[PDB]
Each structure stands twice: as structure tokens, then as C-alpha cells.
Amino acid sequence: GETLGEKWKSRLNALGKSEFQIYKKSGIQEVDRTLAKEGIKRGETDHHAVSRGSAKLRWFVERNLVTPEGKVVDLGCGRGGWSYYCGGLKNVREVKGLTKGGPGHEEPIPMSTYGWNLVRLQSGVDVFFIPPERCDTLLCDIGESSPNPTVEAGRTLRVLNLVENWLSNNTQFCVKVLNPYMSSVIEKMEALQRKHGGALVRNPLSRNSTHEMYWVSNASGNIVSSVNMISRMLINRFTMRHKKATYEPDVDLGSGTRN
């Protein structure tokens, strides 16, 4: 109780260690990352995605759920997986990625993937403190999980209020909604959808251990229904036995500069 998502979260928290690890990957999609990771380790800067995040964003983009263009701001860029992916997209002109980095968090990694010269990544930034800037696309992949969904709600609401500050009339967007099932977050998402449209969409590359959904600009659908469908899916997935992930090839981000 009281929402279905809360029931799922409690059941998730009650799992044994081995049971949790099995559950986390049951019937999900995964990216085949081995060779890309090995190449990056060796100092290779062409082709490779810096994280499995490039493929995660590619899933939204290839389905036109978000269509990055013009000036792209990537809030919480980490190593730069979303930023470098956008750097190669036809209608993108500029990508600014901003992230905490420092001890305990991923630092931006310099790469030479296609359109890298369009991408500027900055570490040591708290995005909640910086003045919003005009942008054509607003991306945000921030949200720290908690065993306590009330804590996640407080965090999620801060992200939602943040991104609201960066959106204009016709902004393309893709925003992680860490916990979309808590009543307070439902209420906020309904208001935001009234104002900016879009809808919440579940990415098949998300793990079963999170109820994250992404608010994407080029989608429609009732907030409550979209969230409850995912609550039911995640509950259904507890019942799977002897199941694991299905892999897909990673993204090839090419090489070279763009003018």
C-alpha cells in the first residue's frame, strides 16, 4: 500500500540479496558494452559510447519521443553519454552538458565521436544553483534512488521544479522521473503535462529495481494510467523464474568533427 507502486517498492525492499540481483535483470533489455568499455580503457576516443546511457537515449530518439535539435542542454551529464549521442544528430547545433563529478561521481570523458566539437561538458557543477539558459532541447537524467519512496518523491519533485525553470513554449525534452508513482509526483506531473504536454514513458533498458519513467515531449497519455501500467509490469516480473536480460549491440557514434 497505498499506491500500487508503493506495494511494489516494499516487495522490492524485502527481497534477499541473490533474489534482488536476479529480479533486477529479469526480462529486461541490456546493451552489449564489453568491447566499447575495453576500447575506452585503452584510450580509444572514436566510435565508443562513454556509458550505456547513449543507447538509453537512442531508444527514445529513434522512436521520435524526443527529437534533439538546436542548442541542447544536458543536466546531470555524467561521463557524457547523452551529450555525445546528441553531438552526432543532424539538427543539433550545440550541446552543453553539466554534472557534479568530483569524488564519488562520474567525470566527463573526452571523446572524438562524431560531432564531439559541438559538445562541451563541465564538471563540478550543481545544476540546482546555476541560472537557467535558453535552449531548444532540455535533457535531464538526475534522480538518486532511496529505499524510502517518500525520500524519492522529495528528490523527484526537486528535479521537476528544476526542469520547469529551463523549459520554454516549444522545447524538446527528455527528463528522468525517478519516482513517478508517489501521489505528490503524480500531482506535479499532471500540472506539468497540462503546461508543456508530453507524457511518461518506460524505457525497456531500465532495470526492474527502479520505477523510473521519462517525461518525453513527443508523447501523450494519461499520467496515472501510464504509471499504474508500469507498477503492474514490475509486480508481474517478481513472478518470473530463471529469467534474465536480452542483449542488443551498442551504439556506434562514429568519429570526426562537424561544421
Ligand X SMILES: Nc1ncnc2c1ncn2[C@@H]1O[C@H](CSCC[C@H](N)C(=O)O)[C@@H](O)[C@H]1O
Ligand Y SMILES: CO[C@@H]1[C@H](O)[C@@H](COP(=O)(O)OP(=O)(O)OP(=O)(O)OC[C@H]2O[C@@H]([n+]3cn(C)c4c(=O)[nH]c(N)nc43)[C@H](O)[C@@H]2O)O[C@H]1n1cnc2c(=O)[nH]c(N)nc21
Contacts to ligand Y by CB under 6 A:
12-13, 15, 17, 20, 145-147, 207, 209-210
128 binds ligand X (CB under 6 A): yes
* Part of the chain binding ligand X (CB under 6 A), chosen from 97-105, 146-154, 220-228, 232-240: 97-105
Q: Any binding-site annotation on 25?
A: no
Buried (b) or exposed (e) across 14-27, using 16+ Cβ within 10 A?
eeeeeeeebbbebe
Return d(Cα 43, Cα 17) in angstroms, integer. 35
Q: Report what 146 binds from ligand X, ligand Y, none; CB cut-off 5-8 Å by kind.
A: ligand Y
The answer to whether the Cα torsion of 144, 70, 248, 242 is positive or negative is positive
What is the DSSP-derived secondary structure letter of residue 9?
Answer: H
| Shortest spacing between CB 12 and ligand X, in angstroms | 21
125 binds ligand X (CB under 6 A): yes
Q: Which amino acid is at 259?
A: N
Return d(Cα 160, Cα 154) in angstroms, integer. 10
For the record, the C-alpha cell of 39 comes out as 576500447
| Shortest spacing between CB 38 and ligand X, in angstroms | 18
What is the DSSP-derived secondary structure letter of residue 76?
Answer: T
Pseudo-torsion of CA 84, 88, 92, 93, nearest 10°?
Answer: 80
**What are the two backbone dihedrals, phi and then psi, of residue 178, each rounded to the nearest 5 degrees?**
-55, -50
| Shortest spacing between CB 167 and ligand Y, in angstroms | 26
126 binds ligand X (CB under 6 A): yes
127 binds ligand X (CB under 6 A): yes
Q: Report what 238 binds from ligand Y, ligand X, none; CB cut-off 5-8 Å by kind.
A: none
First to last CA, the chain: 55
* Among residues 142, 160, 189, 251, the one that binds ligand X under rule CB under 6 A: 142
Residue-level length of the chain = 259
| Shortest spacing between CB 73 and ligand X, in angstroms | 12
141 binds ligand X (CB under 6 A): yes
String of contacts with ligand X for each residue 41-60, x by CB under 6 A: ----------x-xx------
Nearer to ligand Y, 20 or 229 (CB): 20
Return d(Cα 256, Cα 118) in angstroms, integer. 11
Q: Any binding-site annotation on 95?
A: no
* Among residues 23, 60, 82, 114, the one that binds ligand X under rule CB under 6 A: 82
List, in sequence order, every residue forming a beta bridge with 137; answer none if it has no partner. Answer: 72, 172
Q: Report what 224 binds from ligand Y, ligand X, none; CB cut-off 5-8 Å by kind.
A: none
Which residues have CB under 8 Å from 186's CB, separation 6+? 180, 223, 224, 227
78 binds ligand X (CB under 6 A): yes
137 binds ligand X (CB under 6 A): no
Annotated binding site for S-adenosyl-L-methionine: 51, 81-82, 99-100, 126-127, 214
